[PDB]
Amino acid sequence: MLYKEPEDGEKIKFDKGKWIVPNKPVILYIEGDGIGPEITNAAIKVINKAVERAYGSSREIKWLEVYAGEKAEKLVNDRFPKETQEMLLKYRVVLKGPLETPSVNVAIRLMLDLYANIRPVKYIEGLESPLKHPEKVDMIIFRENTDDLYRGIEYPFNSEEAKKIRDFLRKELKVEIEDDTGIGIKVMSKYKTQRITRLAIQYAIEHKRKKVTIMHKGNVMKYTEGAFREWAYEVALKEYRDFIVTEEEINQGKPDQGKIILNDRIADNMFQQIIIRPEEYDIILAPNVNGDYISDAAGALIGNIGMLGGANIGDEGGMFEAIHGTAPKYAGKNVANPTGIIKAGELMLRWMGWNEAADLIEKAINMAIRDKKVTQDIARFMGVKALGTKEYADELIKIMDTI
Amino acid sequence: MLYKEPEDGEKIKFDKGKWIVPNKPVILYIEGDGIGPEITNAAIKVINKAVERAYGSSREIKWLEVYAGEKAEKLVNDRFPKETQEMLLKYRVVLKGPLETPSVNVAIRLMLDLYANIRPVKYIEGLESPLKHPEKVDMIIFRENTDDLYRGIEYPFNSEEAKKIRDFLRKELKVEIEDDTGIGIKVMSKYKTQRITRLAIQYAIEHKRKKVTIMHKGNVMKYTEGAFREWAYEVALKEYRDFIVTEEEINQGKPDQGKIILNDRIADNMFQQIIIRPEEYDIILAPNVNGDYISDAAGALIGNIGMLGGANIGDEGGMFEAIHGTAPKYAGKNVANPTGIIKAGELMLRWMGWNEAADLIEKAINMAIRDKKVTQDIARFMGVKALGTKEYADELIKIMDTI
Numbered sequence A, B: 001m002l003y004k005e006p007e008d009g010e011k012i013k014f015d016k017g018k019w020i021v022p023n024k025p026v027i028l029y030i031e032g033d034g035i036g037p038e039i040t041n042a043a044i045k046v047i048n049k050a051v052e053r054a055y056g057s058s059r060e061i062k063w064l065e066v067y068a069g070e071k072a073e074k075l076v077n078d079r080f081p082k083e084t085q086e087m088l089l090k091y092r093v094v095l096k097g098p099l100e101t102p103s104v105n106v107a108i109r110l111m112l113d114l115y116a117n118i119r120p121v122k123y124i125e126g127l128e129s130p131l132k133h134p135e136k137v138d139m140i141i142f143r144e145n146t147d148d149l150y151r152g153i154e155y156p157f158n159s160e161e162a163k164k165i166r167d168f169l170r171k172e173l174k175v176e177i178e179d180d181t182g183i184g185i186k187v188m189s190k191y192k193t194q195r196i197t198r199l200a201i202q203y204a205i206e207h208k209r210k211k212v213t214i215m216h217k218g219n220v221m222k223y224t225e226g227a228f229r230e231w232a233y234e235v236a237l238k239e240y241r242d243f244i245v246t247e248e249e250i251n252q253g254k255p256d257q258g259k260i261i262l263n264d265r266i267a268d269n270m271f272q273q274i275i276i277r278p279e280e281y282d283i284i285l286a287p288n289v290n291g292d293y294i295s296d297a298a299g300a301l302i303g304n305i306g307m308l309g310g311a312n313i314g315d316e317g318g319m320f321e322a323i324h325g326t327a328p329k330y331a332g333k334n335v336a337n338p339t340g341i342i343k344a345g346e347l348m349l350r351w352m353g354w355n356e357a358a359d360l361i362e363k364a365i366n367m368a369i370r371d372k373k374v375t376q377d378i379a380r381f382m383g384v385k386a387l388g389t390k391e392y393a394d395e396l397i398k399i400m401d402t403i
């Protein structure tokens, strides 16, 4: 066989969207292409120190590397070998480096049905920003990632399918539509909306987040994004009644002191407020297309998109990756910045409920960057000698040793 | 007749989209609700000083007030009187203050087929900003405003229409869709795309602009946003061949000296770059939804939406207004900032080819701010005494008399 499963650890379990983690959970990891190996191994080192520094030996991640991408092709002549697939369906938790494509990421998300795209973006003390006052940027985007126009139901204007549609709309729905038109079908599912929503609220509860904001354009798209809003409130008030409190209730007399706030904002407003007063957002709940855009903008609030981490969560598993590519320019040069993959580590740790260790990582990074101990991607702007990938991780390690 | 048309003026003519303006053009204006009267009259006063200062007496705007809104309800018992519609269909150019929606804006747009939403947004020395470096922010968003999901072709998840759509797509096109789904139809028209593109390029030529960037999400919406991109390039490479050069051609060998650059960016990249380096944008050519969102963000860059002008333009007419509302709390208190509407007039002036008057207005505003001579909405932050509406306008007038 290709992989030797660590007979020392146990697989993570899920009763109903909730993670049940063993003290020695087996976690898979894929180095990635290009800078992948250098930054991933660095992260794994940092994660371990953080785990031992927070729990001593009472907890330990039993890492299991699997092959995917260029390394897999070179070893077994298959970019996504069957055995890799088997370990993924069996352990379902993976930290993976960047993969190039001319799609492993797609396949993984689909076989584990990771419908929720999670994007946390928090300001890091020390980093330059395009914003004058980003000190309070501490939000996390929950993007439904299987619905909306991403379904791909569209047709060219000169196609026969488009014609059948125009014809059908004119007769049955009495809707007027010209011939020179491209056509796409925007779909919004109640089940899909209730899924992400339940996940967004459960997350707020367990991590003491104080607000969930539903992003939508329900005034022009009443039955798609409008319905998204409705279904979101609906399931929130029916299944999390004792934990939440709408905004229309707060300014209605009801008490919110000790509960999670749930409000909604028009797409337009958010694209404006994220720039003017981003501190207003805590958890952002959005359908597929809006969350994609909000994430791009949110992500831009802080310098170097390469220091952000993210994930794809399903009801029984998750994939954690940095928000960047392979950067073949630096492959094997010990120059790339591992903060991105490390932050995916921070995120994974939080999902696992191992917050003490995730806070250690978050704290060491803050301290290292404010202390001018950074990689070239940052050093090149603060006039200092950049640290290498390996040296930087180690600096994070010794820092965690005394905080 | 209810309206006394100035016998000294002439209507503005139209040739293939080109505004043919007499020296004594008649221009309709609507005071609007709330601060409308105060700000609109001040705009007219500054616009007339700009025109005069730039062209002495050889040109003059023959202003014609028409009634719309609550003033219309009060004088002739009609929110959008018949006499007003007739003046609009005849003169086709109007400067309109903010109107409270209880409708008129949409009705004017439709009756004049003003399909293009135009939003210029550029930095003003002295104004606060969310960005640390807004200095080179100087762009104009050209939004197609009659296509896309705004057409309203959508249906509730439990309507009989929705089930017909699901059945149709299932039997005729073989598409799998669950029953608990809201359904919306995104339409992208070749002709609507082509005309907005003609307007943008034509504006670029006319005003010595050098770059047109197409905003789209064609990688996921290939036949709608993607077609918008293809179609835009098409009309550009075929009808303005010796006026523009594509980004592909340039970084391929083609010389760009003496030509307008035409390129395209994926929507998500623009939500990032508009924040990190907006200076990279000149003219943004986008379809309905994208343009809406980018505009929201764009105008958020200056941080005083209430100082932005905008317009709706067709092949034979234009509506110019401020991006703010009726601000009822300040109605008739001579406190409201008139820069928004004045800016709308600046834009009207440029569309008329009266760039000299327009430049005067822009320079005056820049100076008034630089010299801390502003209305309260700005005084608040620069720690100086505030000028009233009336006084801020007379100051701009005092300034244009020196530049």
Ligand SMILES: NC(=O)c1ccc[n+]([C@@H]2O[C@H](COP(=O)([O-])OP(=O)(O)OC[C@H]3O[C@@H](n4cnc5c(N)ncnc54)[C@H](OP(=O)(O)O)[C@@H]3O)[C@@H](O)[C@H]2O)c1
Pocket: A035, A039, A097, A098, A099, A100, A101, A102, A105, A306, A321, A322, A323, A324, A325, A326, A327, A328, A329, A335, A336, A337, A338, A340, A377
């Ligand atoms: N989740 C994923 O797996 C994922 C996501 C996006 C893209 N990709 C892949 O990336 C490949 C091409 O890369 P790209 O050039 O398109 O995006 P990239 O690999 O992310 O390179 C983008 C730029 O950002 C900087 N950068 C990226 N990672 C960095 C790091 N770890 N440390 C410091 N700086 C970093 C580099 O700045 P410099 O100019 O200083 O070199 C580089 O020029 C594509 O084939 C695509 O498949 C994968």
Ligand SMILES: NC(=O)c1ccc[n+]([C@@H]2O[C@H](COP(=O)([O-])OP(=O)(O)OC[C@H]3O[C@@H](n4cnc5c(N)ncnc54)[C@H](OP(=O)(O)O)[C@@H]3O)[C@@H](O)[C@H]2O)c1
Pocket: B035, B097, B098, B099, B100, B101, B102, B105, B306, B321, B322, B323, B324, B325, B326, B327, B328, B329, B335, B336, B337, B338, B340, B377
């Ligand atoms: N083009 C249009 O006709 C148009 C556009 C937008 C909205 N509206 C209409 O406005 C109506 C209600 O008003 P809204 O409150 O919804 O509009 P708004 O855009 O929200 O105007 C009110 C608020 O925005 C600020 N503001 C707007 N213009 C200002 C100015 N010229 N100077 C100083 N501050 C200004 C003020 O903030 P501060 O209190 O801090 O000074 C004020 O409290 C709606 O029914 C809607 O239909 C019309």
